[PDB]
Every structure is written in C-alpha cells, then in structure tokens.
C-alpha cells in the first residue's frame, strides 16, 4: 500500500534540488502534491529556499525524510 | 514518540514508461494517477512531446488523439482502470486490456 | 502481339510487418484481406504465434488474445476495416484508429 | 476509390502452385496474389490449374515459369504458358 504521510502538503520542490528525482517519487507516492514554479502561490511548503516565497513553511529535502522515518509530519527543518 | 522505520521499498514497473494524463477526470481520479504512475516509478510529462508514449483518458476517443498521432505513430491511448488495476496487481499489466478506439 | 504495358509498382505500406487472420470473415473477406495484405507486403503468418505483430479480427474482444499478450506483449489487434482503409486511402493509416478493445 | 491506384485483376481463375524455392518467390507471390490470383498449398497441388518451374508436382497442370508472370502482367491478360 501508498501511506499517507504528506497528505494536505503542497510543495515547491525546485528541479536543482540534490537527489530531486526521489525526493519527489517518495513525496508524491506518501500522498503529497508538487507546486508548478507558476503557482508558487498556492505553496504550502517551499524546499530549498527562503525568500522565495516567505509565506510557505521553509523546508528541506532532511524534512521529506524525517516524515517518512516517523510516519507522519514532523517540525519543520 | 515513533521508533525511526525503514523507507518503504517501492515498485519499479513503470520505469521507463513515459504518461500523459489527458482531459478531466472525475473527483480525485487526476492525483490518483499522478500518485500511481510517479510512485512507481513512471515518468509524467506536461505536455504530449514526442517522448509520451502512453496517453490516459476518462473521455471517449478524441480527434485530438489522431492528430497526434501524425507525429507520434507509436502512441498508446488507455484508461485510467489500467493504471488503477497495475497497482492492484502490483505490476505492469498490458495496456491492451484497456485501450480506447474511435467509435465506428 | 499486344503492347506491352507497365508493370504497377506494388506499394510497400506494411514494410514486412507481421499479420494474423483470427477467428471468421463473412463473405470473401478473407480472401480480400489476404490480397491486400500481401500487395502491401505485410507476412501473413499461418497461426497465432509470437512473431505476430498484427492480430487482424472481425470478431468482438476475445479471452485468447488475453493469454496471447503474455508471450507477446507487443500485439496489436485491429478491425479489417483498417486494411481496407489503407487500400483506400492509399497510405499507411494508424492501427489505432481501428483498434480492437474489451468491450468497456 | 481511384482507377490510377487500384489493383490488377490479371490471375484471376489461375490456381497457382508457387514452390517456395522459385528464385524471387516472394516478390511472385506478392505480384501473383496482388492481382487477384490464388495459390495452393503442397498437400493440395492436385487442384492447381497452374504449376511455377517444377515439371513433376502436377503434370496434369499448365507449366509456367517466373517469365511468364511478368508476361501476363504486361499483357494485361493470361498468355499462352510458357
């Protein structure tokens, strides 16, 4: 089965990101959502970077994986 | 607090697969297909580029799907049950099962 | 003696492509999609075996073609309709647009 | 749908036995069948009007050769067998 980890989460995750390809095949399959770089706006959490949108909660690819270790969402690093 | 658990393996049968979900789906069905096709390792493009070779559709056969078809001879037009049922079955299932043809 | 006349180039569509007549064609269509066929140079296949590229059918979806795409996933089943739109049209139409499908 | 584009209707009636080591078989049969003829198969050589090269498969039938082929296609008609 797909578990559900990330359910409600709407990611900005950029292209250059390290290891990009599974970051986003993990966080898509535990029921996340990526944000196209054109609805940036809607982003509930942003990888890599601050002040791209200051909005968004800051996240980084550590986070993704920490999910995935509890299960569930964790504070944000 | 949880105890730290392995990430979970995922399946590969879709590798090397390139999908393009066409038209509306109905309620979730669109992420339902994202979420199948990504987690398995399968490759989504935006648009219907040369290197689509799968096109999912909910709607009937479209004269859109003939047109290109005149650029990419070797596409496949399939329902979204096909992708439904290789998750089911934790593997690739032929795409023939469910393919959708013009109405005579 | 008679004048002779050219020879008509025979057009080369089906470039050697395997085909297989499944099930029963009423009328002369057999004989009909033999002729075609081979003017066309497609290799007709005496049985369904796992060269077969093309499995040509006027019949509905059928269990058999089933367990035929798990030694050739590749198969395409299509309506005569479709070899007899190739004489017409004079070229090489996509087989998809006369797929043959379950019944949805 | 095009008089240009349709095929000849030259072998029509000439049941053909093409043994399948005639030199340029396959384009023979391509050509034969194309223009409306049929071809028998081995275990039925016995209903052949026509037989390609070997004189023994059906001496009760017409013996024509690849030469022949290409004549009646000419012709636009079935010639004498030759």
Known sequence: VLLDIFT???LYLPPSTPDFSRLRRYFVAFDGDLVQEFDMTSATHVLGSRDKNPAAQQVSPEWIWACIRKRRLVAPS | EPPDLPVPEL???????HFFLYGEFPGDERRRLIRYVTAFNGELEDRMNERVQFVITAQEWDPNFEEALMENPSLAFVRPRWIYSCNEKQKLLPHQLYGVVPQA
Do not use: H
């Open chain 1, 8 to 10: 409600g989460v709407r």
């Open chain 2, 11 to 17: 399946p590969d049968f879709f590798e090397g697969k």
